[PDB]
Amino acid sequence: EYTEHMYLNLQTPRNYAILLRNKLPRLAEMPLFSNQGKLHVRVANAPLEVIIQNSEQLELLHQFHGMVFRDILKIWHPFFVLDRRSKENSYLVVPLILGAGEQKCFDWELMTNFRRLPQSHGSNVQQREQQPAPRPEDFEGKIVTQWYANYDKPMLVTKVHRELTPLSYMEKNQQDKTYYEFTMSKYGNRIGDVVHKDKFMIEVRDLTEQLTFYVHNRGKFNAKSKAKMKVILIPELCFNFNFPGDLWLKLIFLPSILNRMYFLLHAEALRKRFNTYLNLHLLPFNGTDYMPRPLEIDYSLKGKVKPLLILQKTVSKEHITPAEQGEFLAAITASSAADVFDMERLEILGNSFLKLSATLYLASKYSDWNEGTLTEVKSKLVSNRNLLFCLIDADIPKTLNTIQFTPRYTWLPPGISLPHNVLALWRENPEFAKIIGPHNLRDLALGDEESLVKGNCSDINYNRFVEGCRANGQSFYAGADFSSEVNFCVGLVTIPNKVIADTLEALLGVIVKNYGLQHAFKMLEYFKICRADIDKPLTQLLNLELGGKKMRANVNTTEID
């Protein structure tokens, strides 16, 4: 009963959507670990079709998409600019409003009104007198905040109490004390008085500031005591961001969904590439499987021998099963980027298969050698350096999840990027790139104009910024490892080689699990693990289970008995 507000708000038909010009495949269902429960999010299989008949509509949608990050979620930065070049990760998010029944048109009213969110002002008594009387419809299911209290953060009103009114005693702990008199004993010096003393009051509920719902926030919440501190608010003492509150509360989950889809697209592309490369386009290609999650990974706190299924599906393809996006993305998600799952479980299977395949290849290829050199070469093959060198050229590591997704300081917004001029100076001046510090990035104060209609800083401001950058040479900022704070700005990353060495094996692991050893063997040739001889096709496919013998295992005589 202290959580049904989202439970119904999340279940509102009025939703939002993501708008693209390139199409999408089917995507895996995702879980969300909210601070009040668990959520599941899916992407519609069939997108809607809209043509941009007016460039003004496109510009307004872009402005609203930027405004959401700038104000609603507090993601903006002084250097942030709406991207106009539109090459690197450019797209938009558009809300929906229930149109002609099955149609959910764009909330054109919302974009036309809230180009920018209004500012909660400390309205005084004098102007409150002639201001219009608050209406119950004007506040129901909307967004409000307390301009009088130091808690300036936006908050949400759930239901309106027309029967309640000021001068009403607090039902809990203050039966002798009224809301009205408490207001003066708390903020009377700041409000002056409450006008329209006989009107209704509203019941409000707070909003979380947390933006990463991947991990289960296990703890003794004490939900009954969580909402025990109940708030009833006077309408005229609080601002009103008149807004479909359900859409707002859904918008907090947006960055996590965006990041998970961003990486799941890489997973899907890898699945397509590896399915095609092994000539796998049979019936199990279609559809998708909902993404699973593990429990025994610590931080996710909340007769006759059985036939071995892997061998059975290796020899009998009736038991084969299709790999899915979840497994590949799990093999992509590094431990450092501690999501609900990670790549560590498939790593052991991949390591074992790589060891066995290298051993078999060496034995069936170099049978004229002793054990010492064979073991030495085998350990050289499965060594971390070799795996790193053979996976970098595979061009995979740019599509790896290796850093924790914290949006405010370790993320770049989708539709927002750095100014084009400073980027062009940055990516073409290696002598100057290494000296740029985050203080220099925050030196420029780019207002609405630069981000909206310009995309670049002014020439005088350009000179000021570059002078501030060059002044770092004589200060402590010189010689600092700024890549810790600028790589995510320039779309760069630093990754330990252990991650690459383990993630190659993690990739091999799911392939082994789903299909069988014989099909998995070709992937070593794909990563040029073993320069397989075309003269014997089965050596890279099956002869590893069929070869290895010579004259020293063939002679027949009962004398050996």
PDB file of N, CA, C and O in Angstrom, residues 259-260 263-264 291 299 326-345 399-403 499 503 506:
ATOM      1  N   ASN A 259      21.516   1.978 -21.782  1.00  0.00           N
ATOM      2  CA  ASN A 259      22.824   1.329 -21.734  1.00  0.00           C
ATOM      3  C   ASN A 259      22.710  -0.164 -22.022  1.00  0.00           C
ATOM      4  O   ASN A 259      23.508  -0.730 -22.786  1.00  0.00           O
ATOM      5  N   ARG A 260      21.723  -0.824 -21.408  1.00  0.00           N
ATOM      6  CA  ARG A 260      21.582  -2.261 -21.618  1.00  0.00           C
ATOM      7  C   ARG A 260      21.236  -2.579 -23.067  1.00  0.00           C
ATOM      8  O   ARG A 260      21.765  -3.539 -23.634  1.00  0.00           O
ATOM      9  N   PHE A 263      24.440  -2.153 -25.254  1.00  0.00           N
ATOM     10  CA  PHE A 263      25.331  -3.309 -25.254  1.00  0.00           C
ATOM     11  C   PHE A 263      24.668  -4.555 -25.840  1.00  0.00           C
ATOM     12  O   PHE A 263      25.348  -5.396 -26.448  1.00  0.00           O
ATOM     13  N   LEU A 264      23.347  -4.686 -25.694  1.00  0.00           N
ATOM     14  CA  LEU A 264      22.663  -5.852 -26.235  1.00  0.00           C
ATOM     15  C   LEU A 264      22.655  -5.816 -27.756  1.00  0.00           C
ATOM     16  O   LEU A 264      22.591  -6.863 -28.405  1.00  0.00           O
ATOM     17  N   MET A 291      15.928 -12.506 -20.920  1.00  0.00           N
ATOM     18  CA  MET A 291      17.278 -12.565 -20.378  1.00  0.00           C
ATOM     19  C   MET A 291      17.257 -13.150 -18.971  1.00  0.00           C
ATOM     20  O   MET A 291      16.430 -12.741 -18.147  1.00  0.00           O
ATOM     21  N   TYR A 299      27.464 -10.539  -5.215  1.00  0.00           N
ATOM     22  CA  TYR A 299      26.794  -9.243  -5.188  1.00  0.00           C
ATOM     23  C   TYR A 299      25.324  -9.321  -5.579  1.00  0.00           C
ATOM     24  O   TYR A 299      24.591  -8.354  -5.348  1.00  0.00           O
ATOM     25  N   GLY A 326      21.262 -12.993 -24.455  1.00  0.00           N
ATOM     26  CA  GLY A 326      21.640 -12.929 -23.053  1.00  0.00           C
ATOM     27  C   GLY A 326      22.992 -13.555 -22.776  1.00  0.00           C
ATOM     28  O   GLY A 326      23.819 -12.977 -22.064  1.00  0.00           O
ATOM     29  N   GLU A 327      23.245 -14.732 -23.348  1.00  0.00           N
ATOM     30  CA  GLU A 327      24.519 -15.408 -23.122  1.00  0.00           C
ATOM     31  C   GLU A 327      25.682 -14.592 -23.673  1.00  0.00           C
ATOM     32  O   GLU A 327      26.714 -14.431 -23.010  1.00  0.00           O
ATOM     33  N   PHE A 328      25.534 -14.073 -24.896  1.00  0.00           N
ATOM     34  CA  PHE A 328      26.613 -13.298 -25.498  1.00  0.00           C
ATOM     35  C   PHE A 328      26.891 -12.029 -24.704  1.00  0.00           C
ATOM     36  O   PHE A 328      28.052 -11.706 -24.426  1.00  0.00           O
ATOM     37  N   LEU A 329      25.840 -11.304 -24.313  1.00  0.00           N
ATOM     38  CA  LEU A 329      26.044 -10.084 -23.542  1.00  0.00           C
ATOM     39  C   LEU A 329      26.672 -10.396 -22.190  1.00  0.00           C
ATOM     40  O   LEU A 329      27.535  -9.649 -21.712  1.00  0.00           O
ATOM     41  N   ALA A 330      26.249 -11.494 -21.555  1.00  0.00           N
ATOM     42  CA  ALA A 330      26.898 -11.929 -20.324  1.00  0.00           C
ATOM     43  C   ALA A 330      28.385 -12.160 -20.546  1.00  0.00           C
ATOM     44  O   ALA A 330      29.216 -11.687 -19.763  1.00  0.00           O
ATOM     45  N   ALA A 331      28.739 -12.869 -21.620  1.00  0.00           N
ATOM     46  CA  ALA A 331      30.143 -13.050 -21.969  1.00  0.00           C
ATOM     47  C   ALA A 331      30.834 -11.728 -22.280  1.00  0.00           C
ATOM     48  O   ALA A 331      32.067 -11.661 -22.235  1.00  0.00           O
ATOM     49  N   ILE A 332      30.072 -10.686 -22.599  1.00  0.00           N
ATOM     50  CA  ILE A 332      30.646  -9.368 -22.849  1.00  0.00           C
ATOM     51  C   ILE A 332      30.807  -8.576 -21.556  1.00  0.00           C
ATOM     52  O   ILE A 332      31.805  -7.875 -21.372  1.00  0.00           O
ATOM     53  N   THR A 333      29.844  -8.681 -20.642  1.00  0.00           N
ATOM     54  CA  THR A 333      29.854  -7.895 -19.411  1.00  0.00           C
ATOM     55  C   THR A 333      31.009  -8.338 -18.521  1.00  0.00           C
ATOM     56  O   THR A 333      31.001  -9.454 -17.990  1.00  0.00           O
ATOM     57  N   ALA A 334      32.000  -7.468 -18.355  1.00  0.00           N
ATOM     58  CA  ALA A 334      33.133  -7.773 -17.497  1.00  0.00           C
ATOM     59  C   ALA A 334      32.737  -7.699 -16.024  1.00  0.00           C
ATOM     60  O   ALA A 334      31.686  -7.165 -15.658  1.00  0.00           O
ATOM     61  N   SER A 335      33.600  -8.259 -15.174  1.00  0.00           N
ATOM     62  CA  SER A 335      33.343  -8.253 -13.737  1.00  0.00           C
ATOM     63  C   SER A 335      33.374  -6.839 -13.170  1.00  0.00           C
ATOM     64  O   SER A 335      32.587  -6.505 -12.277  1.00  0.00           O
ATOM     65  N   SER A 336      34.287  -5.999 -13.668  1.00  0.00           N
ATOM     66  CA  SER A 336      34.400  -4.635 -13.156  1.00  0.00           C
ATOM     67  C   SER A 336      33.095  -3.872 -13.340  1.00  0.00           C
ATOM     68  O   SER A 336      32.623  -3.192 -12.421  1.00  0.00           O
ATOM     69  N   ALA A 337      32.492  -3.976 -14.524  1.00  0.00           N
ATOM     70  CA  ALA A 337      31.150  -3.450 -14.763  1.00  0.00           C
ATOM     71  C   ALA A 337      30.136  -4.425 -14.161  1.00  0.00           C
ATOM     72  O   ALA A 337      29.445  -5.176 -14.850  1.00  0.00           O
ATOM     73  N   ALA A 338      30.060  -4.397 -12.830  1.00  0.00           N
ATOM     74  CA  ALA A 338      29.328  -5.408 -12.070  1.00  0.00           C
ATOM     75  C   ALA A 338      27.826  -5.181 -12.220  1.00  0.00           C
ATOM     76  O   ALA A 338      27.171  -4.527 -11.406  1.00  0.00           O
ATOM     77  N   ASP A 339      27.275  -5.737 -13.295  1.00  0.00           N
ATOM     78  CA  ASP A 339      25.831  -5.818 -13.462  1.00  0.00           C
ATOM     79  C   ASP A 339      25.327  -7.031 -12.680  1.00  0.00           C
ATOM     80  O   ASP A 339      26.050  -7.618 -11.872  1.00  0.00           O
ATOM     81  N   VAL A 340      24.070  -7.423 -12.903  1.00  0.00           N
ATOM     82  CA  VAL A 340      23.524  -8.580 -12.197  1.00  0.00           C
ATOM     83  C   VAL A 340      24.260  -9.855 -12.600  1.00  0.00           C
ATOM     84  O   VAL A 340      24.458 -10.758 -11.778  1.00  0.00           O
ATOM     85  N   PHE A 341      24.678  -9.950 -13.858  1.00  0.00           N
ATOM     86  CA  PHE A 341      25.479 -11.064 -14.344  1.00  0.00           C
ATOM     87  C   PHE A 341      26.855 -10.567 -14.773  1.00  0.00           C
ATOM     88  O   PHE A 341      27.161  -9.372 -14.713  1.00  0.00           O
ATOM     89  N   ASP A 342      27.686 -11.505 -15.215  1.00  0.00           N
ATOM     90  CA  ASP A 342      28.996 -11.184 -15.761  1.00  0.00           C
ATOM     91  C   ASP A 342      29.499 -12.380 -16.559  1.00  0.00           C
ATOM     92  O   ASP A 342      28.810 -13.392 -16.711  1.00  0.00           O
ATOM     93  N   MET A 343      30.717 -12.246 -17.066  1.00  0.00           N
ATOM     94  CA  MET A 343      31.320 -13.195 -17.988  1.00  0.00           C
ATOM     95  C   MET A 343      32.095 -14.320 -17.315  1.00  0.00           C
ATOM     96  O   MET A 343      32.626 -15.185 -18.018  1.00  0.00           O
ATOM     97  N   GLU A 344      32.173 -14.340 -15.984  1.00  0.00           N
ATOM     98  CA  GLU A 344      33.128 -15.228 -15.328  1.00  0.00           C
ATOM     99  C   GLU A 344      32.716 -16.693 -15.404  1.00  0.00           C
ATOM    100  O   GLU A 344      33.582 -17.574 -15.359  1.00  0.00           O
ATOM    101  N   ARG A 345      31.419 -16.983 -15.521  1.00  0.00           N
ATOM    102  CA  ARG A 345      30.987 -18.377 -15.456  1.00  0.00           C
ATOM    103  C   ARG A 345      31.348 -19.144 -16.724  1.00  0.00           C
ATOM    104  O   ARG A 345      31.812 -20.287 -16.650  1.00  0.00           O
ATOM    105  N   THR A 399      33.550  -3.283 -28.322  1.00  0.00           N
ATOM    106  CA  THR A 399      32.161  -3.582 -27.999  1.00  0.00           C
ATOM    107  C   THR A 399      32.058  -4.397 -26.715  1.00  0.00           C
ATOM    108  O   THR A 399      31.304  -5.369 -26.634  1.00  0.00           O
ATOM    109  N   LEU A 400      32.822  -4.018 -25.695  1.00  0.00           N
ATOM    110  CA  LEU A 400      32.839  -4.730 -24.425  1.00  0.00           C
ATOM    111  C   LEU A 400      32.333  -3.840 -23.298  1.00  0.00           C
ATOM    112  O   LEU A 400      32.624  -2.640 -23.260  1.00  0.00           O
ATOM    113  N   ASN A 401      31.572  -4.439 -22.386  1.00  0.00           N
ATOM    114  CA  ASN A 401      31.096  -3.760 -21.186  1.00  0.00           C
ATOM    115  C   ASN A 401      32.137  -3.957 -20.092  1.00  0.00           C
ATOM    116  O   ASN A 401      32.275  -5.059 -19.550  1.00  0.00           O
ATOM    117  N   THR A 402      32.873  -2.894 -19.765  1.00  0.00           N
ATOM    118  CA  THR A 402      33.985  -3.012 -18.834  1.00  0.00           C
ATOM    119  C   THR A 402      34.017  -1.945 -17.749  1.00  0.00           C
ATOM    120  O   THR A 402      34.914  -1.989 -16.902  1.00  0.00           O
ATOM    121  N   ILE A 403      33.084  -0.996 -17.740  1.00  0.00           N
ATOM    122  CA  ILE A 403      33.070   0.081 -16.757  1.00  0.00           C
ATOM    123  C   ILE A 403      31.673   0.194 -16.165  1.00  0.00           C
ATOM    124  O   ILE A 403      30.672  -0.011 -16.861  1.00  0.00           O
ATOM    125  N   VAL A 499      41.043  -8.940 -19.019  1.00  0.00           N
ATOM    126  CA  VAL A 499      39.648  -8.933 -19.447  1.00  0.00           C
ATOM    127  C   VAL A 499      39.521  -9.513 -20.850  1.00  0.00           C
ATOM    128  O   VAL A 499      38.646 -10.340 -21.118  1.00  0.00           O
ATOM    129  N   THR A 503      37.723 -12.908 -21.907  1.00  0.00           N
ATOM    130  CA  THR A 503      36.486 -12.741 -22.663  1.00  0.00           C
ATOM    131  C   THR A 503      36.512 -13.526 -23.965  1.00  0.00           C
ATOM    132  O   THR A 503      35.456 -13.943 -24.447  1.00  0.00           O
ATOM    133  N   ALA A 506      35.368 -16.752 -22.768  1.00  0.00           N
ATOM    134  CA  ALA A 506      33.944 -16.632 -22.475  1.00  0.00           C
ATOM    135  C   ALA A 506      33.114 -16.736 -23.748  1.00  0.00           C
ATOM    136  O   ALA A 506      32.060 -17.381 -23.761  1.00  0.00           O
TER     137      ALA A 506
END
